[PDB]
Ligand binder design. Structure first.
Ligand SMILES: *[C@@H]1O[C@H](CO)[C@@H](O)[C@H](O)[C@H]1NC(C)=O
Ligand SMILES: *[C@@H]1O[C@H](CO)[C@@H](O)[C@H](O)[C@H]1NC(C)=O
Ligand SMILES: *[C@@H]1O[C@H](CO)[C@@H](O)[C@H](O)[C@H]1NC(C)=O
Ligand SMILES: *[C@@H]1O[C@H](CO)[C@@H](O)[C@H](O)[C@H]1NC(C)=O
Ligand SMILES: *[C@@H]1O[C@H](CO)[C@@H](O)[C@H](O)[C@H]1NC(C)=O
Ligand SMILES: *[C@@H]1O[C@H](CO)[C@@H](O)[C@H](O)[C@H]1NC(C)=O
Ligand SMILES: *[C@@H]1O[C@H](CO)[C@@H](O)[C@H](O)[C@H]1NC(C)=O
Ligand SMILES: *[C@@H]1O[C@H](CO)[C@@H](O)[C@H](O)[C@H]1NC(C)=O
Ligand SMILES: *[C@@H]1O[C@H](CO)[C@@H](O)[C@H](O)[C@H]1NC(C)=O
Ligand SMILES: *[C@@H]1O[C@H](CO)[C@@H](O)[C@H](O)[C@H]1NC(C)=O
Lengths: 904, 49
């Protein structure tokens, strides 16, 4: 008894594929399965996998056709006695692994070779024998290992040469299904939703009226009559073969004598909404053709003159208690377990329990507020409600990313979480992993079971989100905890204490915005209804949908160019680079293009293009999909941002409104300090320190971009969303929406010109719907991008071309400056802000009065220091002597505290 | 191919020739001064060699 690690993979067809992932369903050998060694007849069971380092039959006797295989190969399907060569029809004369498969009479044979150990090797087809026999047993002919094939889906990987170089079993692990669902081998960290789940039924329940009798169903035919309280044995609304499983009430038979000349007059065109069964029979071995007006259905002169019947059965159902129906062995009642229903006329599935609903005596069924059957009356007069189909929901897999581990936890969304545990170990769940264990269960507050994660008591910053307040993470086996909102802090409030900063720092932070998206086009008549005319004529009937679709996509494309134009083309003149790149003590390189390099992009703007990944020639595909080019090249968009930075460096604020006015860039930074409420002396006395902080902040940005993981996250999301929408549209062309084939020229080549028009219509309607869905969702996406481009144009005017007082609009501090940089399908702002720090404590008063005259500070607050009172600004400590020019007087000090002999 | 188009065939008489290229198709657009200045126009055949 050994294990088959990854053995038994073969090419499923004879079609060449290269560099792709292909999902298929067929009989395969599950990974890490049980393989029975041999160091003896063996059952077949719909296929086997055979190795070694054959005779096929049904009874291994003379009464059952058998087969024998054997570089001279002899395949002879004859009743060889186990001297017998009779009763046979087929003859054929011309680490090793073999696969055997019996289907539709043919017996397929695959074979491989390699000079059970570990590894995987791929087999190829050899024979396909139309034996057409029944194979259940076999025996070897003389260290051979036997597997078994089961219906499973695999994901097979091809390479450039078209060789199967890997596979995945999509029913082995939760991770294996996750890989199979997203169609990849490496998976990022996160939580993904996958196939649903549902508890499988547990039993069969039947309840029929206990009345038993022999029915006159036969007497009436050979001789309007009613039949009731019998058991018949045995079409316009029912199938004859399906009549012996439904229970009716008072089946009626209409009988009369008419020759075959009038049988073709009894049918609708008999009510129009009613059903029934009609029989007729002739043997030859009155009527009215005059009446004023016709008759309503089911209501009641010459002679036919017979010379040498029609029974219209009517069925009434689900109205009164069931009394007429065929043989059905009853069953006992089971409650509180997902079972099957076969009540009088209600076949379903669910959970039963006693009810508390006051049925009226003349009622037998129940209904909800939405017309669902949430109650029933047992044929033995009992009210039991069949609430819900036991259980179902969704399944989500939590993974750290497959780059750090292969351990995952599984969440079941909406379950009491005790039913799941019972079904897992009872083998009662449709998602059936071959290798999966349960060690511990946590019940999320409202998100259901969590299996594979251990609860911890501490709290962290919610790596992966789950449920309501409960998140999960790997480093913190994976652990599930409760969210932590932040750091608890306290402040001692008082009435005569204030805090004033005594130092600051320069901070530069980045901001990423998308402004545009891909500009695609379609060829309506080529995507649908390809290079053909029989189909092209059929598509003219659907009005002019193609013209509508082309107009909508042309509107989106022309809008993307307005987006980029509105954000960047905000300068009237193209200022040349100052060819100095050192102002005051500020280093402006790495944001201005280098003149000694080929590409005219700044250093920081070159790292942004190496972060986002997308994966004349003039290539074209068969599907009619294409992407148009932008109007502004990447070298023109980069010339706009270099002009904007050059204008800010020299001439500062006043470019745009008016004409650019020079300024040495050290005088304006002083002016930018007055905006945030700090005097000029602060800059001019600490210019060297401030310049150092500026240069360091830029360097950290450059280093971070080089060695980060995801800062251009929003720009990548736009690329992924557009590629996912096109891939869905392309893969919808390999789908047959009801026709026998999904490719034209395969039904257009085998046609009758009467039957091929119905399948072509099936594809046309299916492909038109998929096109409309693509256009609708692109219109919604394009409106969301327009919102982000409108905001980016506001930030260019208010953060780059000026100074902003709106709180936290540009940056996070006080917004000295801001520089733009170009990114693929986006823009990056670098906000330079001012951050005070190093608080101190002081004593303060509202006002000061000298000689009965109060003195309020014209601008600032009063402080005490430790020796004498002073007046200072709020954002920086710079005490000043209290004089008559800092203060002003208003009234007498009767409600304002404090006094000192320091004024004037 | 992915969309169940052949895109490549084997010559019965010992060769393999690419069916991929579906020759040329696209959309045409007309550039006009506006039937007022003049009546001469230019045509753009999009995505062709
Ligand atoms: C192979 O059979 C043995 C014996 O029952 C069993 O313990 C083992 O789990 C089987 N292999 C696998 C992969 O399940
Ligand atoms: C099989 O052989 C027997 C004689 O052993 C013969 O009677 C019978 O017809 C054969 N079955 C056929 C021909 O289907
Ligand atoms: C394809 O096969 C050739 C020779 O058999 C080999 O040189 C080449 O590397 C293979 N393809 C790849 C992608 O390696
Ligand atoms: C019933 O009989 C009356 C007698 O005049 C007749 O007018 C009427 O049409 C009949 N019913 C129907 C449905 O025609
Ligand atoms: C508020 O501050 C005043 C000093 O101006 C002090 O006298 C008073 O006690 C304070 N209120 C308190 C401590 O509740
Ligand atoms: C302000 O902080 C810088 C470093 O961030 C330091 O070098 C400087 O001495 C500080 N100034 C004061 C007045 O504390
Ligand atoms: C500006 O920084 C670069 C490196 O980022 C350095 O090579 C250059 O010398 C600095 N500026 C000046 C004027 O040196
Ligand atoms: C156009 O066709 C010529 C002829 O072979 C070829 O050399 C050229 O590369 C083609 N151009 C494009 C854009 O396909
Ligand atoms: C300022 O005083 C408050 C309370 O008086 C105290 O909580 C805080 O730590 C002090 N901070 C400094 C920088 O002195
Ligand atoms: C502020 O207080 C400090 C410490 O008490 C003192 O050294 C300094 O001289 C004071 N400032 C004045 C008196 O202007």
């Amino acid at each position: 008894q050994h294990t088959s690690s990854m053995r038994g993979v073969y090419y499923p067809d004879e079609i060449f594929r290269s560099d792709t992932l292909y999902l298929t369903q067929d009989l395969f050998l599950p990974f890490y399965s049980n393989v029975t060694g041999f160091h003896p007849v063996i059952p077949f069971k719909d296929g086997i996998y055979f190795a070694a380092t054959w005779v096929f039959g049904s009874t291994m006797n003379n009464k059952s056709q058998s087969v024998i295989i054997i570089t001279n190969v002899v395949i002879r399907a004859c009743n060889f006695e186990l001297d017998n060569a009779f009763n046979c029809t087929f003859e054929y004369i011309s680490l090793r692994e073999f696969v055997f498969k019996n289907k539709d009479g043919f017996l397929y044979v695959y074979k491989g070779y390699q000079p059970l150990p570990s590894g995987f090797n791929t087999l190829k087809p050899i024979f396909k024998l139309p034996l057409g026999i029944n194979i259940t047993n076999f025996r070897a002919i003389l260290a051979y290992f036997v597997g078994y094939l089961k219906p499973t889906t695999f994901m097979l990987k091809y390479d450039e040469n078209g060789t199967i170089t890997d596979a995945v079993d999509c029913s082995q692990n939760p991770l294996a299904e996750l890989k199979c669902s997203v169609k990849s081998f490496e998976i990022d960290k996160g939580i993904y939703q996958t196939s649903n789940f549902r508890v499988v039924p547990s039993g069969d329940v039947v309840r029929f009226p206990n009345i038993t009798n022999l029915c006159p169903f036969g007497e009436v035919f050979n001789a309007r009559k009613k039949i009731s309280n019998c058991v018949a044995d045995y079409c316009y609304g029912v199938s004859a073969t399906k009549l012996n499983d439904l229970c009716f009430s008072n089946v009626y038979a209409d009988s009369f004598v008419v020759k075959g000349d009038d049988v073709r007059q009894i049918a609708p065109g008999l009510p129009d909404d009613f059903m029934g069964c009609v029989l007729a029979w002739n043997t030859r071995n009155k009527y009215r053709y005059l009446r004023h007006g016709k008759l309503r259905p089911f209501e009641r002169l010459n002679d036919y003159g017979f010379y040498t019947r029609v029974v219209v059965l009517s069925f009434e159902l689900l109205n009164a208690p069931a009394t007429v129906c065929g043989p059905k062995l009853s069953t006992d009642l089971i409650k509180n377990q997902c079972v099957n229903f076969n009540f009088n006329g209600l076949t379903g599935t669910g959970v039963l329990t006693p009810s508390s609903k006051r049925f009226q005596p003349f009622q037998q069924f129940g209904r909800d507020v939405s017309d669902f059957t949430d109650s029933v009356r047992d044929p033995k007069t009992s009210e039991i409600l069949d609430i819900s189909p036991c259980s179902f929901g969704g399944v989500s897999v939590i993974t750290p990313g497959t780059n750090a581990s292969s351990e995952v936890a599984v969440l079941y969304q909406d379950v009491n979480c005790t039913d799941v545990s019972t079904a897992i170990h009872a083998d009662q769940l449709t998602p059936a992993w071959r290798i999966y264990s349960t060690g511990n269960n946590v019940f999320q507050t409202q998100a259901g079971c969590l299996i594979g994660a251990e609860h911890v008591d501490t709290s962290y910053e919610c790596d992966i989100p789950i449920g309501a307040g409960i998140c999960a993470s790997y480093h913190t086996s994976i652990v599930a905890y409760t969210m932590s909102l932040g750091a608890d802090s306290s402040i001692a409030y008082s009435n005569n204490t204030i805090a004033i900063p005594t130092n600051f720092s320069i901070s530069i932070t980045t901001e990423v915005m998308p402004v545009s998206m891909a500009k695609t086009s379609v060829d309506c008549n080529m995507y649908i209804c390809g290079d053909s005319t029989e189909c092209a004529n059929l598509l003219l009937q659907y009005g002019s949908f193609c013209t509508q679709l082309n107009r909508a996509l042309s509107g989106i494309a022309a809008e993307q160019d307005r987006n980029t134009r509105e954000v960047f083309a905000q300068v009237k003149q193209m200022y040349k680079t100052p060819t100095l790149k050192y102002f005051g003590g500020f280093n402006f390189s790495q944001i201005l293009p280098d003149p000694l390099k080929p590409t005219k992009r700044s250093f920081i703007e070159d790292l942004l293009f190496n972060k986002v990944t997308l994966a004349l020639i003039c290539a074209q595909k068969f599907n009619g999909l294409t992407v148009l080019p932008p109007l502004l090249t990447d070298d023109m968009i980069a010339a706009y941002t270099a002009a904007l930075v050059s204008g800010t460096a020299t001439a500062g604020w006043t470019f745009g409104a008016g004409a650019a006015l020079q300024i040495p860039f050290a005088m304006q930074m002083a002016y930018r300090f007055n905006g945030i409420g700090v005097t000029q002396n602060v800059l001019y006395e600490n210019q060297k320190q401030i310049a150092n902080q500026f240069n360091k902040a830029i360097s950290q940005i450059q280093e971070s971009l080089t060695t980060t993981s995801t800062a251009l996250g929003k720009l990548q999301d736009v690329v992924n969303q557009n590629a996912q929408a096109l891939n869905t549209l392309v893969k919808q062309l390999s789908s047959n929406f009801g026709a026998i084939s999904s490719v034209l020229n395969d039904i257009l080549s085998r046609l009758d010109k009467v039957e091929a028009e119905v399948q072509i219509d099936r594809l046309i309607t299916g492909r038109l719907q998929s096109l409309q869905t693509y256009v609708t969702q692109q219109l919604i996406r394009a409106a969301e991008i327009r919102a982000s481009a409108n905001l980016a144009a506001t930030k260019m005017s208010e953060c780059v071309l000026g100074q902003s007082k709106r709180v936290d609009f540009c940056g996070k501090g006080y917004h000295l400056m801001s520089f733009p940089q170009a990114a693929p399908h986006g823009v990056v702002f670098l906000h330079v802000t001012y951050v005070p720090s190093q608080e101190r404590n002081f004593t303060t008063a509202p006002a000061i009065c000298h000689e009965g005259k109060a003195y309020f500070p014209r601008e600032g607050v009063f402080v005490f220091n430790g020796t004498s009172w002073f007046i200072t600004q709020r954002n920086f400590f710079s005490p000043q002597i209290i004089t008559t020019d800092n203060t002003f007087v208003s009234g007498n000090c009767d409600v304002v505290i404090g006094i000192i002999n320091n004024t004037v």
